[PDB]
Amino acid sequence: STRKAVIGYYFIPTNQINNYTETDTSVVPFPVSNITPAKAKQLTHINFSFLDINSNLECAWDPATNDAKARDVVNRLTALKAHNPSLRIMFSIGGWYYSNDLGVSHANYVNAVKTPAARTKFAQSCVRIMKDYGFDGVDIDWEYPQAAEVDGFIAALQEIRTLLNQQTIADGRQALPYQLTIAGAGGAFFLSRYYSKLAQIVAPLDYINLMTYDLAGPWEKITNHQAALFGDAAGPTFYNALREANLGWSWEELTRAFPSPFSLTVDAAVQQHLMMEGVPSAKIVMGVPFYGRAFKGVSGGNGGQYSSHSTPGEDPYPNADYWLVGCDECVRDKDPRIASYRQLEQMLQGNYGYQRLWNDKTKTPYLYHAQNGLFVTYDDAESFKYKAKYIKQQQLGGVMFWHLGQDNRNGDLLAALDRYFNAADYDDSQLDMGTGLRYTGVGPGNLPIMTAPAYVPGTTYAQGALVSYQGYVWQTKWGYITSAPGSDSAWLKVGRLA
Ligand SMILES: C#CCO[C@@H]1[C@@H](C)[C@H](OC(=O)NCCCCCNC(=N)NC(=O)NC)[C@@H](C)C(=O)O[C@H](CC)[C@@](C)(O)[C@@H]2OC(C)(C)O[C@H]([C@@H]2C)[C@H](C)C[C@@]1(C)O
Ligand SMILES: C#CCO[C@@H]1[C@@H](C)[C@H](OC(=O)NCCCCCNC(=N)NC(=O)NC)[C@@H](C)C(=O)O[C@H](CC)[C@@](C)(O)[C@@H]2OC(C)(C)O[C@H]([C@@H]2C)[C@H](C)C[C@@]1(C)O
Numbered sequence: 001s002t003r004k005a006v007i008g009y010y011f012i013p014t015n016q017i018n019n020y021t022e023t024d025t026s027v028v029p030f031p032v033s034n035i036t037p038a039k040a041k042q043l044t045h046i047n048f049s050f051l052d053i054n055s056n057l058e059c060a061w062d063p064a065t066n067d068a069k070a071r072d073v074v075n076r077l078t079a080l081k082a083h084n085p086s087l088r089i090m091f092s093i094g095g096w097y098y099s100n101d102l103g104v105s106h107a108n109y110v111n112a113v114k115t116p117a118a119r120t121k122f123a124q125s126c127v128r129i130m131k132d133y134g135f136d137g138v139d140i141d142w143e144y145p146q147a148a149e150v151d152g153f154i155a156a157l158q159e160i161r162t163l164l165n166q167q168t169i170a171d172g173r174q175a176l177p178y179q180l181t182i183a184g185a186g187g188a189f190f191l192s193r194y195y196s197k198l199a200q201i202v203a204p205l206d207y208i209n210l211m212t213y214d215l216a217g218p219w220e221k222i223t224n225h226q227a228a229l230f231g232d233a234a235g236p237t238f239y240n241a242l243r244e245a246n247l248g249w250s251w252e253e254l255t256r257a258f259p260s261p262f263s264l265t266v267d268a269a270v271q272q273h274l275m276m277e278g279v280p281s282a283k284i285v286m287g288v289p290f291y292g293r294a295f296k297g298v299s300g301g302n303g304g305q306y307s308s309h310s311t312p313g314e315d316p317y318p319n320a321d322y323w324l325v326g327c328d329e330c331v332r333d334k335d336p337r338i339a340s341y342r343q344l345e346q347m348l349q350g351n352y353g354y355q356r357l358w359n360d361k362t363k364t365p366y367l368y369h370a371q372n373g374l375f376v377t378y379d380d381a382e383s384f385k386y387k388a389k390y391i392k393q394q395q396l397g398g399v400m401f402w403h404l405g406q407d408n409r410n411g412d413l414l415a416a417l418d419r420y421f422n423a424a425d426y427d428d429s430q431l432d433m434g435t436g437l438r439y440t441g442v443g444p445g446n447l448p449i450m451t452a453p454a455y456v457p458g459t460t461y462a463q464g465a466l467v468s469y470q471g472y473v474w475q476t477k478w479g480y481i482t483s484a485p486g487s488d489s490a491w492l493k494v495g496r497l498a
Contacts, residue, residue: 003086004391004421005207005285005398007045007181008414010035011405012073014062020069030405032076037083039411042418044398045179046077047139049092051129053108057118058125059093071133078134088179091133093126094141101146109142113152123159127167130178137179138164139209144185147246150194154201157182161204179206183400186212186269186287188262192241199278206283209400210273212266213289216377218311218337223295223304224264226377227288228362229386231263231437235306235362238264242272252477252492257443265362266387268439270394275443281395286387288399290341290406290413292367292378294324303357304368304375311337325372326352340406341413344378358382361436381416388420389428442494447472450495455485472496 012030022031035046054060061070077089098105112122126138138160145153161180168177182205185191194201202208216224222236231237243258257275262268266286273279297310312318317335324336326347339347344367348354354367354374363386367376379387391399399417407413419426442448455469462479473495474485485491 002282003044004396005044005400006042006414006417006421007047007090007207007209007285007398007400008043009047009049009092009401009403010077011049011403014064017069017073018064018066020073032073032080035077035080035404036411037080039404039414040080040083040087042411042414043084044086045088045090045137045181046080046404047090047092047181047400048074048077048135049403050095050098050141051091051093052098052105053093053112053122054105055108057108057112057122059122059129060125074133074135078136086176088136088176089134090137090139090179090181091130091135092139092141092183094143094183096143099142099144109145110149113145113149113156115152116155119152119156119159122156123163126160127163127178130164131167136176137181137206139181139183141183143183143211144190144193146193150197150201153194154197157201157204181205181207181209181285183287184208184210186210186266187215187264188238188240188242188268188272191269191272192245195242195245195272195276196247198273198276202279202283207285207397207400208273208283209285209287210266210269211287211402212269213287213379213402214293215264217293218295218309218313221308223298223307223309223375224377225305225359225362225364225366226293227379227383228263228265228359228364229383229390229436230267230361230363230434231265231439232305232359232361233437234302235263237261250489253443256492256494257441259440262439263437265437265439267390270390270396271439271441271446274394274446275441277443277445279445282397285397285400286391288379288384288387288401290379290401290403292339292341292344292376294327294337294339294367295375296323296336296373298373298375300368300370300373303355303359303366304373305359305366307375309375323372324374325369326350326354339376339378341378341380342406342408344376345408360434363387363434363436379413381412384413384416385420385428385431386433388417389431389433392421392428444493447493447496449498451497457484458482466494468497 022033164178213227216226240258240260295309295311298304298307322336330336450473452466455467460480465476469485474491475494481490
C-alpha cells in the first residue's frame with residue numbers, strides 16, 4: 001500500500017544559478033522548467049544539491065552564490081508541489097567534492113560534528129536554511145565520516161531530527177512532515193567506516209539512500225559493472241572489509257555474515273544493511289545511476305567486461321583527448337569518462353560503432369566499442385525492472401538516483417521507475433531474476449524463518465545439529481553439546497520461529 005519513494009537529485013552549479021535562465025540551453029542545460037508536471041508527479045522527492053559547511057561550521061550556500069537568483073531557483077522547485085501534494089524539495093549538504101577525505105571543505109564536516117556546541121550550531125543552521133528557502137527536508141551527503149567522527153555524526157543527526165520535529169509541529173506539517181536523509185555508502189570499503197553503528201545512524205532518518213553505483217571506475221585494475229544487481233562469477237571479487245569492523249562478534253558470526261571475497265553489487269550493500277539489527281528495510285532506498293562510466297584501452301573477447309584498461313583516474317581529466325566517440329557532452333565537460341544516459345542513447349543511435357550488450361547475471365546493460373576498445377557501464381529501463389522488482393521483494397523504501405539532468409528529454413528513466421512501482425497494468429511476477437550470485441550473509445537483523453525439533457535436556461548433539469529453543473533455531477558449532485542454546489559459546493543462533 002505505501003508508495004515507494006522516488007528520489008531524484010537536482011544539481012545545478014553556482015554560475016548557472018548566478019546566470020539562471022530557462023530559455024538558453026548553453027548557459028543552463030537543465031533548468032527547472034524541464035521538470036514537467038508529469039515528471040513532478042513521478043517523483044516523491046527532489047534533492048536540490050549542493051550546499052556545504054563553511055568554516056563557521058554552519059550550513060551554507062557557496063559564498064559565490066547570488067542569494068536572489070538562488071531563492072528564485074528554489075521557488076521554482078517548490079512551485080512544482082502544486083502538481084503533487086506528496087512531493088518534497090529537500091536540499092543536500094556535501095557531496096564528494098566538498099566532503100571526501102581530501103575535499104575542499106572536509107575539515108568543516110569533521111569540526112561541525114565534533115562538540116555538543118558545534119553540533120547545536122550546525123543543526124540550527126540546517127533548519128534555519130530549510131525554513132528560510134522553503135525546503136522540505138535535509139539530506140546530508142558526507143562521503144564519509146570516519147570511525148572517530150562517527151559518534152559525532154550520529155549526534156548531529158539526532159539533533160537535526162529533534163529540530164525538524166519541532167519545526168513540523170510549529171508549521172502544522174503532520175501531513176507532510178519535515179524529513180532527514182543521508183546518502184549512504186553502497187559498497188563495503190566505505191560502509192565499514194560506520195557499519196558497527198549502522199542502527200544508530202539510520203534511526204533518526206526517514207531514509208538512508210544507498211549509493212549503490214560507481215562501484216566500478218577508472219581507479220580499478222579491471223573494467224566492471226558499476227551497479228550490478230547480482231554477481232557474475234566471471235567478474236572480479238573483493239575483500240569484505242566488514243568482517244574487520246569492530247562488531248564484537250565471534251568467528252562463526254563473522255563468517256556467516258561476511259563472505260570473502262564477494263561480489264560488489266547492489267544486492268550485497270542492501271543485504272549488508274539488512275543483516276544489522278534495528279535497520280528496517282522500509283528505510284533503505286536503492287540508489288541508481290542515470291549516467292554511464294566509460295573506459296578505454298580495453299582488449300575484449302568478452303564485450304570489454306573484466307578487462308584491463310587505460311582510463312586515467314586523475315582529476316581533472318589530464319588532457320584534451322575526448323575519446324568517447326560520439327559523446328558531445330564529454331567535450332563540453334572536458335571529461336570522456338562520464339556520459340549521461342541521455343547522451344548514451346544518442347551515441348548508440350548514431351553511427352559510432354557501439355553495441356549495446358546485456359549481462360544476464362548482473363541484469364545490467366553495457367556498451368562495447370570493438371574497434372577502439374571501449375566499455376561503458378550504465379543502467380537503463382530494462383535493468384530497472386529487475387531492480388524495481390528487487391525493491392518490492394526485499395520491501396525497501398524506494399529508489400534514489402543521480403541525477404535528473406541526465407535522464408533523456410522525455411524522462412524515460414523516471415517514467416520507467418514510476419511505472420514499475422505504480423502502474424496497475426505492469427506485471428513483473430513472471431520476470432526472471434536470473435541465476436547471478438546472491439549475497440548470502442546472515443546476521444542478527446535478517447535471520448531466516450526456520451523449524452527444528454525442540455531442544456531436549458540431556459541429549460548429546462553432534463556438530464551441525466539444529467534445535468529450537470526460546471524463539472529461535474540454533475545450531476551446534478561443534479559436538480558433542482549438552483548445554484542449553486544461548487547459554488554458552490557452542491550454539492549459533494541461525495534462524496527464528498514463526
Ligand atoms: C555527485 C558528484 C561528484 O561531484 C561532481 C564533480 C566532482 C564531477 O564528478 C562527476 O560528476 N562524476 C559523476 C559520478 C557521480 C557518482 C558519484 N556520486 C557521489 N559520489 N555522490 C553522490 O551521488 N551523491 C548523492 C566532475 C566531473 C566535475 O565536474 O568536477 C568539476 C571539475 C571538472 C568541479 C570539481 O569543478 C565541479 O564543477 C561543477 C561542474 C560546477 O560541479 C561542482 C564542482 C565544483 C560540484 C560541486 C561537483 C559535481 C557535482 O559536479
Ligand atoms: C589505489 C589508488 C590511488 O587512488 C586511491 C583510490 C582512487 C582507490 O583506488 C584503488 O584502491 N585502486 C586500486 C585497485 C582497486 C582494488 C580495490 N578496489 C576497491 N577498493 N574498489 C571499490 O571500493 N570500488 C568502489 C579507489 C578504490 C577509491 O576509493 O576512489 C574514491 C572514489 C570512490 C576516491 C577517488 O574518492 C578516493 O577516496 C578515498 C578512499 C577517500 O581516497 C582518496 C580519493 C579521494 C585518495 C586520494 C585516492 C586513493 C589513494 O584512495
